[PDB]
Amino acid sequence: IAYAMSIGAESSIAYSNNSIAIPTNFSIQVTTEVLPVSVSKTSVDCTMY
Amino acid sequence: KLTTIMLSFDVNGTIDKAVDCSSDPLSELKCTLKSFNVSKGIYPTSNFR
Ligand SMILES: *[C@@H]1O[C@H](CO)[C@@H](O[C@@H]2O[C@H](CO)[C@@H](O)[C@H](O)[C@H]2NC(C)=O)[C@H](O)[C@H]1NC(C)=O
């Protein structure tokens, strides 16, 4: 199948010039980030190659 | 006998010192690293023995 990229769901916020919205409840979530540190230490030789 | 050796020379064309890297691991290190003074550490070596 072929389509166009959905950049995201189009949202709208009512900026009403005197109103705020305040959170009344919260949540705690754990996010996982993976970062490489090193690669394999490859040593080549003059003889035998 | 046929042997690989390393020979140094001075400004006068005289031979300073020899290695003969078929006898000692330090000699093989000296022939591998192309030097007569070797810094402290670990070095892979060639197959001159
Ligand atoms: C705020 O939200 C949390 C979860 O986001 C609510 O905690 C849950 O409450 C229900 C009802 O008692 C329990 O069955 C669940 O076990 C609770 N935990 C989770 C992880 O869902 C909490 O009740 C909310 N508080 C208010 C005031 O809305």
Ligand SMILES: *[C@@H]1O[C@H](CO)[C@@H](O)[C@H](O)[C@H]1NC(C)=O
């Ligand atoms: C080379 O020979 C001269 C003598 O003319 C001497 O003074 C000098 O020290 C010699 N150089 C080396 C490296 O032996």
